[PDB]
Design a protein around this nucleic acid. Structure first.
Lengths: 135, 88, 131
RNA sequence: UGCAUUAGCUAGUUGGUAAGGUAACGGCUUACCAAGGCAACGAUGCAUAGCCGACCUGAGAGGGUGAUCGGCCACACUGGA
RNA sequence: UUGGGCGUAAAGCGCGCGUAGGCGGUUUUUUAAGUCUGAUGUGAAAGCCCACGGCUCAACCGUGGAGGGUCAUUGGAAACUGGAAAACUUGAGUGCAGAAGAGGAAAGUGGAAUUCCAUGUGUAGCGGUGAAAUGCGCAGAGAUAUGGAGGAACACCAGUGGCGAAGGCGACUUUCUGGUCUGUAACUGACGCUGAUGUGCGAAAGCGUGGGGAUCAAACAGGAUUAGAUACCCUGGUAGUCCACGCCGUAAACGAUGAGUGCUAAGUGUUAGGGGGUUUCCGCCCCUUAGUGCUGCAGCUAACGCAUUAAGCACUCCGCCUGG
């Protein structure tokens, strides 16, 4: 450009739309508004619990859950681990962390934190999935 | 659009010095009567649009001479504004 | 309607420096002749020569080279322009190619050079990083 | 700080003319005079946010945080006297 | 900014013209404003230069100048910018001698054609078909000429011709002109460029009027083909067509290259003006200008390809762009 017209119009920087839009939002419960305070994990409660097919040619059924957060936003959150305590209405904790090859669902479910305990039969991934260190 | 004797007629009555063609005032009757020509000559031909900017682009070519009449000598600009009829 | 005299004059040098010329000139002024003097004061060319004509006469260049059919003038660039008039401080003034170029200095001390303003303790309007 | 997917903004306003009254100033209000003054350099309005030091990472060109830790401003259920 | 691109990748509206704005040729003299320096005060507390002291190390707190080397109080210097006084003309305009035309708005001359009505003429087919048929034929359908008419344009001169900013411009004779260009360069002394605003044009189709339905032709129709129709075939035929009378504001409006100025290998035709040597019985060779074109260095890019009618080497302005 010109440094003349750069005075007339400056180099305005570019924005970056950040991932996980449901974790940087609160709710003014008194005034029905929304805060923005960027939690690590905002807790919620399950509404539906199901599974999903990866559309990429890897084949499995990975378990997801329709969770509503504190700020009442409904998500589809991946439930890692094998067994669970997530039949319905479990008051759970939810992280970020997208699971790839799975459309729409881009949230994890914090194992063993809020109302679930973690999975039992793990011995190489013991710190995750709610398992206390043995002996 | 303008004949040779007619410009060489106005250099007798309106020049600033001898061999002074290109003067500010020597393209005013050359400008505005040839406007008044084309004002009636495009009154005949209502689609003489290229001959329309032929005189308007030399409005500024005279106006820049009026613009040049400010900075060098302003008494010549009081002279030449009040010489003929030109607004502003 | 050219705006930088001392740049188009400087790039015309590099315009014929590419095709290995030994003889060109440039128009004159109060400055540009004396600007061309500071080139041949250091002596990067054979001799820059006399101004002759009516208005801004041609003052020659006589491009002086190496014996391996080479060229000496690597890099030719005015830094200032109409729109950006740049200046220099004497206390942190750099060295072109870390001691292998020159950088002239323009003020009302006379238009001076890198040596002629480092021990003059004035800066000024810098022009050429020519090495 | 940003929006012209905010352009025409103001009418005690705009200058002055006399009374106040203030620790002082005046369009600050009141009677008078001209529409003036303010504007695309975006006035006006909207939305957002206490400010600065300071933090922080950047080669420098620097710009993002304020729990900090200091300096200033504003507030004390709300709104007036 | 330092430290990005706008021909095919994302980055030029369809072109302009133009208001503001920005940025402007050349050569002299004043200031010291801007520049750059010099005397100090001199810039912040944990944060910040350098070296110690305090912490068992250290985590964590002080010391000493550095100290501002940025701001102010102060002195100055004019090349270059700001203002002040001049000139030169390349650049531009006003001159003069001429070339060309499809450049826009108005009047004439005639040709040829599809359609019609009539003569002569005649009677079995005429038209249309890749294949046949619908149709048009017994009224004479067409035909056929000295000769009767209509609609609408006007092959030939027709071209990597010319003019127009662009959309564009075509039988011409004339009207009014635009504008291009060369040459002499007389003169004013840079009178310029971008070009936000604004104003125009704005191709085709569409909203409508009057000539329009002669031909063409969406929509519609007919005949069959074809395994499939009314599709590829065919006509008839509606507005729309043609033009004038109102526009809309859109195109691959693309040279997919914004506009003005300097500089770096060539050859090669061609359009207009000036330059000639022989001459030619109007023709050969060659200088130049402005261009119209075709090949082709260095440089260029990712390569294509560009290279005097740059995407090369520099300057000024506007606009645009930054994953789909």
């Amino acid at each position: 450009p010109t440094i003349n017209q750069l005075v007339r119009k400056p180099r305005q920087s570019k924005i970056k739309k950040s991932d996980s839009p449901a974790l940087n939002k609160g709710f003014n419960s008194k005034k029905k508004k929304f805060t923005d305070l960027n939690s690590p994990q905002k807790r919620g409660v399950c509404t539906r619990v199901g599974t999903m097919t990866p559309k990429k040619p890897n084949s499995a059924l990975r378990k997801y859950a329709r969770v509503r957060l504190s700020n009442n936003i409904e998500i589809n959150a991946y439930i890692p681990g094998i067994g669970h305590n997530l039949q319905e209405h479990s008051v759970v904790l939810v992280r970020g962390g997208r699971v790839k090859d799975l459309p729409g669902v881009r949230y994890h479910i914090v194992r063993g934190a809020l109302d679930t305990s973690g999975v039992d039969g793990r011995r190489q991934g013991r710190s995750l999935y709610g398992t206390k260190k043995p002996k | 659009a303008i004949s040779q004797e007619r410009k060489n007629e106005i250099i007798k009555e309106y020049r600033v010095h001898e061999t002074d063609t290109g003067s500010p005032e020597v393209q005013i009757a050359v400008l505005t009567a040839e406007i008044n020509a084309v004002n009636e000559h495009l009154r005949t031909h209502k689609k003489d649009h290229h001959s329309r900017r032929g005189l308007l682009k030399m409005v500024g070519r005279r106006r820049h001479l009026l613009n040049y009449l400010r900075s060098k000598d302003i008494q010549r600009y009081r002279e030449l504004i009040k010489s003929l009829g030109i607004r502003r | 309607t050219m705006t930088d005299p001392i740049a188009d004059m400087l790039t015309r040098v590099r315009n014929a420096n590419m095709v290995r010329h030994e003889k060109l000139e440039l128009p004159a002024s109060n400055i540009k002749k004396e600007i061309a003097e500071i080139l041949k004061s250091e002596g990067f060319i054979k001799n820059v020569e006399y101004v002759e004509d009516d208005k801004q006469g041609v003052l020659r260049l006589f491009l002086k080279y190496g014996q391996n059919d080479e060229r000496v003038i690597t890099g030719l660039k005015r830094i200032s322009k109409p729109g950006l008039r740049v200046y220099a401080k004497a206390s942190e003034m750099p060295k072109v190619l870390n001691g292998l170029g020159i950088a002239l200095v323009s003020t009302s001390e006379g238009v001076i050079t890198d040596k002629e303003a480092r021990k003059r303790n004035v800066g000024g309007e810098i022009i050429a990083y020519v090495w």
